[PDB]
Amino acid sequence: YSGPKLEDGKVTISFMKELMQWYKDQKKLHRKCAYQILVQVKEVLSKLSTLVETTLKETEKITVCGDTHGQFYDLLNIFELNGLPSETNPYIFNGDFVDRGSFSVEVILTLFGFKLLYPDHFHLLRGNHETDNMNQIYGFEGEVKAKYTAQMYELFSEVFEWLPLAQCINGKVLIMHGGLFSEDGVTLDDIRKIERNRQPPDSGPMCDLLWSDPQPQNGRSISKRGVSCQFGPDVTKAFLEENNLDYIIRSHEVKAEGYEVAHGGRCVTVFSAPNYCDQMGNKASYIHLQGSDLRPQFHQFTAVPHPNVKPMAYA
Ligand SMILES: C[C@]1(C(=O)O)[C@@H]2CC[C@@H](O2)[C@@]1(C)C(=O)O
Ligand SMILES: [Mn+2]
Numbered sequence: 001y002s003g004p005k006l007e008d009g010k011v012t013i014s015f016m017k018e019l020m021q022w023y024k025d026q027k028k029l030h031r032k033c034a035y036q037i038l039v040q041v042k043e044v045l046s047k048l049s050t051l052v053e054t055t056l057k058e059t060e061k062i063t064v065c066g067d068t069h070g071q072f073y074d075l076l077n078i079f080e081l082n083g084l085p086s087e088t089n090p091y092i093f094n095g096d097f098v099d100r101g102s103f104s105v106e107v108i109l110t111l112f113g114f115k116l117l118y119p120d121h122f123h124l125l126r127g128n129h130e131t132d133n134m135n136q137i138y139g140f141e142g143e144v145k146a147k148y149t150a151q152m153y154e155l156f157s158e159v160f161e162w163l164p165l166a167q168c169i170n171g172k173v174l175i176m177h178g179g180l181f182s183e184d185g186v187t188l189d190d191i192r193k194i195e196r197n198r199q200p201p202d203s204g205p206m207c208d209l210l211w212s213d214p215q216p217q218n219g220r221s222i223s224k225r226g227v228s229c230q231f232g233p234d235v236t237k238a239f240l241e242e243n244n245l246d247y248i249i250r251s252h253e254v255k256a257e258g259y260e261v262a263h264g265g266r267c268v269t270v271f272s273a274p275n276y277c278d279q280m281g282n283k284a285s286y287i288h289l290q291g292s293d294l295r296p297q298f299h300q301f302t303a304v305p306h307p308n309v310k311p312m313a314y315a
């Protein structure tokens, strides 16, 4: 083994640079190093609140990315366009890191590595795909079994259970993978209090955060996905008012331009997997927020080449 090695058992910036190159070249991180990253990141995530609360000073910025779905070469493109993560270039990845794309292992270990390196500036929120039933079907479990072992997969599953479910910036912008709730009256404190270290239930606030979608018409509808609901602009308005928020950013749906702003400004979708599954032909985007101006600034990007491995090859 002549690949990336942790230094004194810990992630460093040089390790991360070596790792990204190793992965670009289609090589595998030694199982012992992967294991160390997973055990250490479990510890880090398990100490976090279900609702991560982050203050952005006036001179600070943050980048918000939506679904990446194992599109590792596109993840590298994000970092090339927007800079590597650091204490002055923080990131939030809003769920759905794995499944569908066939470089899910490379995406997730790169994301976990950066979480370890910059724990206060590199944020990961759970998506509906960071779950066992989804991973069993949509590629990630197959990919981990192919590259490592079932035991390694079990560890990933345990780590995913500790991913926080939402993040609030400056008490003004709430970020979650899916969206808002099937019942009125949910508060930020209710979210804080969710016991998240589990597979999601098929109903209730944890399910909704990971699974719901906005709809343009007022009200709520039964979801076509078979779980959670669609929520209209009236739902969003009431939730923002009760919680003293400005707007929400969510992900969870492909958008041709990589983003959408619904509910009159109140419900933003960001989606960061361009040409999704090598077929959708969509642009992707990421968002910049600034401490002095939390209105979203969209930055679009398009797919880059990757090795010839088909989406879902491991599913
Ligand atoms: C189909 C998708 C998936 O994750 O299964 C994939 C494509 C759009 C979005 O990401 C999706 C609907 C989601 O679950 O977030
Ligand atoms: Mn998704």
Ligand SMILES: [Mn+2]
Pocket (backbone or CB within 6 Å): 096, 127, 128, 129, 177, 210, 251, 252, 253
């Ligand atoms: Mn999703």
